[PDB]
């Protein structure tokens, strides 16, 4: 019966919590109470990229630490040369309601998606000398919140229909469908090994998926509101979540529970984006109070504040070499900080 | 900008910089309106001449040297709070209410309260359309305006009943810098884009006066 199956679910939930409490011998702050703090990180705006005339919702560094694509409500993707502050390309969009963008690791493609429920792939390197649409991926029911390239042929998309998908670009069909979330999926982070990825939805939960067989492995629940951002640790054995409850939390897969929470009494605004440094010691998070906060991932203490934006910081990104951090915001400008 | 190829890259960037200017300039003349309301409430038929350009439906029509862009969000059967900030820059909001749908009118009141008091739409004006006015007069003859509002102590006529519903919707407005506009049109008023045009023209004057510091 419905009641009979209800009791079994409660017992499984209680059993999981019993195992969770059994492996919590000491909190991470207890073991990390005897190493020197980072001090006070003071980064400065080294570049200011101008040319967008609306809110910026997404950006992504290329795998060379020099090229980055930015998406804005003006219906255009602009590829920047961050070194020279140059516009390599300007790609008009069929739909101006864009909320995500991705840069292919090979550098030959970019991704775009939003309220049109469609992920669009653009071929940057063409014999005709112009950027053209290579594929239009359809099948999602709700708005597309995030997309991340795996290779030139596979992409993973998160949508507002409580579902993530894996696509074959050449075929244009969903190879795998990921189901289990109760709320809208908002963020999506790919593991360095590409065999796993984690997503955070509006049900105040995060789920770890494997692209090989497409079944949820772990479910994390420590937040009180919508999860807006997620990103893997460089090790690939941990990830960080930013939420609307003005809190950041760090989860570990092998321990399978929360390790550290990042909050302050003076912060009452949700997190829009999260990112790690090259070594994972610094956790950079964008907030709704017009600022980006730098966190000590091992100390849960603020080490610096990035305050140069006149509107909400909606984007974050750390280069592959860790030299620069680029921050996009609703003020139509995005800056590079090092 | 020293080598020969570096100079040609800067010239390409300046050419792209130029084209961004006209595209933004050309988009400035556009008027963006957000259509809201309950399902099957005349939302898609507010203007007879509206022509479409399943997430978002964009409809465009130029009335008098003024391009209007209308966006309908009804296919996004999801959490509105995660994508409603994309329309924070709209000129006004067009809300449609069925005066005939008694059952759906309380849902309209709840929907109307949220949009007025949403943190993004605190200074965004709202044009209110009361549809099905012709059927409302025929409907009140059989079913009176007591089932929807038990607290209605007034005449059972048409004009008096219409004002009570309009007053309730305007009660949800609290900020004094929004200027809700009300209009009644059911199915046959062909001139229904003029009222939107007049309301938008009124809205821009108030915005200009505030920008000029006079208001």
């Amino acid at each position, epitope marked *: 019966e419905l009641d009979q199956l209800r009791q079994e679910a409660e017992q499984l939930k209680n059993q999981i919590r019993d195992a969770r409490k059994a492996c919590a011998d000491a909190t991470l702050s207890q073991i990390t109470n005897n190493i020197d703090p980072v001090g006070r990180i003071q980064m400065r705006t080294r570049r200011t990229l101008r040319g967008h005339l609306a809110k910026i919702y997404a950006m992504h560094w290329g795998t060379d630490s*020099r*090229l980055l694509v930015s998406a804005s409500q003006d219906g255009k993707l602009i590829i920047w*040369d961050s070194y*020279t502050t*140059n516009k*390599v*390309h300007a790609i008009p969009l069929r739909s101006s309601w864009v909320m995500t963008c991705a840069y292919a690791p090979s*550098g030959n493609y970019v991704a775009c998606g939003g309220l049109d429920n469609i992920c669009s792939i653009y071929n940057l390197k063409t*014999r*005709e*000398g*112009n950027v053209r649409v290579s594929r239009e991926l359809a099948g999602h029911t709700g708005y597309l919140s995030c997309c991340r390239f795996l290779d030139d042929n596979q992409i993973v998309t998160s949508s507002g229909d409580t579902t993530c998908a894996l696509w074959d670009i050449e075929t244009g069909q969903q190879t795998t469908t990921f189901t289990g979330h109760t709320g809208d999926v908002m963020s999506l982070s790919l593991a360095p090994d590409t065999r796993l990825f984690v997503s955070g939805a509006c049900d105040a939960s995060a789920k770890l998926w494997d692209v090989r067989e497409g079944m949820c492995r772990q479910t994390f629940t420590g937040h009180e509101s919508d999860i807006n951002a997620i990103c893997f640790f460089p090790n690939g054995n941990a990830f960080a979540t930013g939420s609307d409850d003005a809190t950041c939390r760090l989860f570990d897969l092998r321990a399978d529970q929360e390790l550290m929470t990042y909050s302050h009494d003076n912060i009452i605004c949700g997190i829009t984006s999260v990112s790690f440094s090259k070594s994972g010691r610094l956790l950079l998070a964008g907030y709704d109070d017009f600022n980006c906060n730098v966190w000590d991932a091992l100390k849960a203490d603020r080490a610096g504040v990035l305050a140069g934006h006149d509107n909400r910081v909606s984007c974050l990104g750390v280069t592959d070499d860790g030299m620069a951090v680029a921050t996009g915001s609703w003020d139509s400008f995005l800056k590079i900080w090092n | 900008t*020293l*080598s*020969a*190829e*570096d*100079k*040609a*890259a800067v*010239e*390409r960037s300046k*050419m792209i910089e130029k084209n961004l200017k006209e595209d933004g300039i050309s988009a400035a003349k556009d008027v963006k309106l957000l259509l809201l309301g309950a399902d099957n409430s005349g939302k898609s038929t507010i203007v007879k001449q509206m022509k479409i350009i399943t997430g978002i439906v964009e409809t465009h029509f130029t009335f008098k040297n003024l391009h209007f862009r209308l966006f309908d969000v009804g296919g996004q059967r999801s959490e509105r709070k995660k994508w409603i900030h994309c329309f924070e820059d709209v000129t006004a909001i067009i809300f449609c209410v069925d005066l005939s749908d008694y059952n759906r009118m309380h849902e309209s009141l709840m929907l109307f309260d949220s949009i007025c008091n949403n943190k993004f739409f605190i200074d965004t004006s709202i044009i209110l359309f009361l549809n099905k006015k012709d059927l409302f007069g025929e409907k009140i003859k059989k079913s009176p305006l007591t089932i929807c509002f038990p607290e209605y102590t007034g005449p059972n006529t048409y004009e008096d009943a219409a004002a009570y519903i309009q007053a309730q919707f305007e009660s949800k407005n609290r900020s004094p810098n929004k200027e809700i506009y009300c209009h009644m049109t059911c199915a046959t008023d062909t001139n229904n884009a003029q009222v939107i045009f007049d309301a938008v023209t009124d809205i821009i004057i108030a915005n200009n006066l505030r920008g000029c510091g006079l208001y």
Partner: single-chain antibody, 231 residues
Framework: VQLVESGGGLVQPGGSRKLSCSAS????????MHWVRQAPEKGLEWVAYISSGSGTIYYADTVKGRFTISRDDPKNTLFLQMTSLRSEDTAMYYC??????????????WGQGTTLTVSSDIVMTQATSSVPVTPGESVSISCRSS???????????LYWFLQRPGQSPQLLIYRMSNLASGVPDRFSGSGSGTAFTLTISRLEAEDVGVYYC?????????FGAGTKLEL
């Protein structure tokens, strides 16, 4: 992608002639355009350059004041107005497309030009002229430069072109080390400042011809004498 040249023929000395090239298959509004000569028994020679948007225009020292370069983007055509023709202007004129951004491949496409009968600068040196090779051996082609082509931005500007008999030259390597689209991976280029080489591993047919080294560090653009491989 197709560039077709028109004009040329028997022109008496002191006359005028207009050469036109029609572009089809690509976007003729984002590509810089070039003119390159080739004397009947000599190497390539740069003539003129017009940028996208007709902003920057350059000429060689031997054609300045006599040659004019212009384009009409809506008509997808490039022009070269030549006045006061001399006996030294008798050559085959090639139209070359070129795009310029981060990671571009300039001088990617050439068009089969039209012959014409009329009857400091960086010095590029290719001492080797004729080299006999076998179908399967590995050969190296060397080029020399008077100046150091390495720039302060880490980009050194050397170009390698192959001109098979009865064909227009095609790009093999751009910027001393970069392979062009459609070029087999056996071609490889390497070198340093004022010293360059091009390696062709596992030489076979269709690799015979004249190889030219060209510098894009600054205008005017200078070519080499040409290294000819013979089977």
């Amino acid at each position: 992608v197709q560039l077709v040249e028109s004009g040329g023929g028997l022109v008496q000395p002191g006359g005028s002639r207009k050469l036109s090239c029609s572009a089809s298959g690509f976007a003729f509004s984002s590509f810089g355009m070039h003119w390159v000569r080739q004397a009947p028994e000599k190497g390539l020679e740069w003539v003129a350059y017009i940028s996208s948007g007709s902003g920057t225009i350059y000429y060689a020292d031997t054609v300045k004041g006599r040659f004019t370069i212009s384009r009409d983007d809506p008509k997808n055509t490039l022009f070269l107005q030549m006045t006061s023709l001399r006996s030294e202007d008798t050559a085959m004129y090639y139209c070359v497309r070129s795009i310029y951004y981060y990671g571009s491949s300039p001088f990617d496409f050439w068009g089969q030009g039209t012959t014409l009968t009329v009857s400091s600068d960086i010095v590029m040196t290719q001492a080797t002229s004729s080299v006999p090779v076998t179908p399967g051996e590995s050969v190296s082609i060397s080029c020399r430069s008077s100046k150091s082509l390495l720039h302060s931005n880490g980009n050194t500007y050397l170009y390698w072109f192959l001109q098979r008999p009865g064909q227009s030259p095609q790009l093999l390597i751009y910027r001393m080390s970069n392979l062009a689209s459609g070029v087999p991976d056996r071609f490889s280029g390497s070198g340093s400042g004022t010293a360059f080489t091009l390696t062709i591993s596992r030489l076979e047919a269709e690799d015979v011809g004249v190889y030219y080294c060209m510098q894009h560090l600054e205008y005017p653009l200078t070519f080499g004498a040409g290294t000819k491989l013979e089977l």
